[PDB]
Design a binder for these strands. Structure first.
Lengths: 95, 49, 100, 85, 50, 158
DNA sequence: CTATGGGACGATAAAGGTATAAATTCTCTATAATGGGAGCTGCTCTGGCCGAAGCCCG
RNA sequence: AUACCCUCGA
DNA sequence: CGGGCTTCGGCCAGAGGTCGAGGGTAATAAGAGAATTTATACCTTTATCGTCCCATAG
């Protein structure tokens, strides 16, 4: 349900032994994309994993019984941004 | 339900769990039953050592 | 290169000069400077993205990024302290090669 | 919000702009005292504080000044998440 | 979560069997929310105990 | 303890779990030598805050004092505003600003010196000192009353 | 007859001195020593890339 | 709680 | 007969299912001693800020 995550990428670890969750890899993400289901896919790759401020807020919402799902931004993309920057090639946004 | 009642396919699994007394920087950790903040029934299950 | 592009009728040469034009116009439009390809300064990853996860028993597990960064830092420090004392040219160039 | 993520060459000036210090020491942590060293790969001057809202010496431990950098402690007291950016 | 699958011939097409422990672990925050809403648990420690 | 529980609940409501257990902190801790999980503890903090707000709803001043003493952000601002409205009803804008600054200084918020308050307001040190002395006792009495009222419900709900 | 500004007061925290032990890096030793070594070998294709060798050709 | 190696299931 | 010009052959890059599950293994040796800096520890000096007596304005 919830537990400790990996320290580099804030994602649940793997395997009964470290608790851990199954991974919605590329193929399962494609399967969700083939369906029109985008909200569950976005919540799945955003709220259930890789978002620090999203996980706790979603837990709050579930406990109070409302399902709002404030999105936020995955932490793995931030990690990618910093790695690409450390490769000496600039990344920004157009705001 | 006979195959469970006659207990034909039950198996015995043995698993082990380990503890090591590390030379911690402040001091060696000791194998003592006076765990701090330990409940009574759990200590009752344990021995003096 | 644009002036010399249509002078030659060779397909291979026109292709090479077309690639040259593409790169030059990309650099001109993109606000990118050619000198930036050779980095005179390089970044270092934030520590949690290159963490050292301590092994149980008081050991520390160092990531490959930490080893590579340490190697670069060591060779850079060697470079400065061997140029500041005017080491011979051969060893200086060897050190520059090592840093590269 | 945002859009249109860009990619370009990193300028030395913008590389300086990105950084929060000049890493100069190869070693990372002292074997005697287990805190990152000055100008190291984990230095608190550059990358941030080890403990959230804390400094190197503990001169300021209160949770009030989240942006002020102390006099003795040049390592600015801030949240521990900042070691990632 | 995951487990070995098993044919259920008494299932309607829209439903699937789910073990008690997997369902209890997966829906733990929902159970906590319903327990607090019904008032059967006051503190989350009591809800975890139940 | 009721005070400890309220303080922990306010801190956990104000501060999210955190990006992760810091790798340097984890490394330093593991190389130098709770019953509920993080999200569970945060949910417990939210439930405790809700219970405290509901129990103390009969005394708006007590709830404002609790929010000012323990909570942060919007709750702290509301508590400070309610305290200013209660202690100093007819304060002028300069007087209101000075009272707000003094109340923040009481909760260890900046500014931390009455001299800075005088510089930002222009009030005499004698009047500021007397007002602070009276307000500290008043707020201590209010907080003690609120804690005494909430101690029984906290033990009742565990 | 009372609330408030004004001024006196004083207990202490910071600032600077100022040595002082820790601690942590820096510098030396004089028979002679003067090109390293693991590196795989059993993909498979596709694709691109240079570079060389024929192939028109006027 | 990081990387390889081995073994196994669909 | 040199010269563009097409074509071909050798060389290197990249890419090769997913999700489990379990197990295991992960990395060493100059002492001396001189010197320099730094964290520590005690102490004095100045300002600061908490503090209250006092005259006065309404």
């Amino acid at each position: 349900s919830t537990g400790s995550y990996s320290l580099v990428t804030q994602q649940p670890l793997g395997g009964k032994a470290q608790f851990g969750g199954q991974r919605f890899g590329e193929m399962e993400v494609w399967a969700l994309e083939a369906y029109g289901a985008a909200y569950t896919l976005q919540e799945m790759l955003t709220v259930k994993s890789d978002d620090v401020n999203g996980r706790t807020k979603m837990y709050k919402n579930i406990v109070d019984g409302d399902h709002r799902m404030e999105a936020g931004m995955p932490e793995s993309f931030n990690v990618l941004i910093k790695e690409i920057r450390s490769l000496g090639i600039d990344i920004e946004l157009e705001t | 339900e006979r195959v469970v009642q006659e207990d034909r396919f039950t198996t015995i699994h043995i698993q082990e769990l380990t503890c090591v007394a590390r030379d911690t920087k402040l001091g060696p950790e000791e194998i003592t039953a006076d765990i701090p903040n330990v409940g009574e029934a759990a200590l009752n299950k344990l021995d003096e050592a | 290169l644009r002036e010399e592009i249509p002078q030659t009728n060779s397909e291979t040469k026109i292709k090479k000069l077309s690639k040259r034009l593409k790169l030059m116009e990309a650099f001109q439009g993109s606000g990118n400077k050619p000198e930036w390809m050779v980095l005179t300064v390089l970044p270092v990853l934030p520590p949690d993205l290159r963490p050292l996860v301590p092994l149980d028993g008081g050991r520390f597990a160092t990531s490959d990024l930490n080893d590579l960064y340490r190697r670069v830092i060591n060779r850079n420090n060697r470079l400065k302290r061997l140029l500041d004392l005017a080491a011979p040219d051969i060893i200086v160039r060897n050190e520059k090669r090592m840093l590269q | 919000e945002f859009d249109a993520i860009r990619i370009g060459l990193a300028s030395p000036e913008m590389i300086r702009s990105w950084s929060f210090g000049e890493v100069k020491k190869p070693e990372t942590i002292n074997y005697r005292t287990f805190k990152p060293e000055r100008d190291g790969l984990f230095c608190a001057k550059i990358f941030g504080p080890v403990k959230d809202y804390e400094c190197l010496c503990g001169k300021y431990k209160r949770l009030k000044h989240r942006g002020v950098i102390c006099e003795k402690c040049g390592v600015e007291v801030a949240l521990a998440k900042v070691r990632r950016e | 979560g995951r487990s070995v699958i098993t044919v259920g011939p008494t299932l309607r097409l829209h439903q699937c069997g789910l073990p008690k422990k997997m369902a209890l672990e997966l829906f733990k925050p929902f159970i906590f929310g319903k327990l607090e809403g019904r008032g059967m648990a006051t503190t989350i420690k009591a809800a975890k105990k139940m | 303890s009721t005070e400890q529980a309220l303080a922990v609940a306010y801190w956990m409501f104000e501060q999210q779990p955190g990006p992760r257990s810091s790798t340097a902190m984890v490394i330093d801790s593991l190389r130098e030598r709770s019953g509920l999980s993080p999200h569970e503890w945060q949910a417990q903090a939210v439930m405790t805050v809700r219970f405290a707000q509901r129990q103390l709803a009969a005394h708006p001043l007590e709830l404002a004092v609790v929010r000012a003493e323990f909570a942060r952000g919007r709750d702290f601002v509301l508590g400070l505003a309610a305290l200013r409205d209660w202690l100093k009803p007819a304060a002028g804008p300069i007087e209101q600003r000075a009272a707000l600054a003094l109340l923040m200084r009481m909760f260890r918020r900046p500014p931390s010196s009455i001299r800075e308050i005088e510089r930002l307001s222009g009030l005499s040190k004698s009047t500021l000192h007397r007002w602070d002395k009276e307000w500290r006792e008043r707020v201590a009495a209010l907080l003690r009353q609120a804690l005494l009222r909430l101690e029984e419900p906290m033990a009742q709900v565990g």
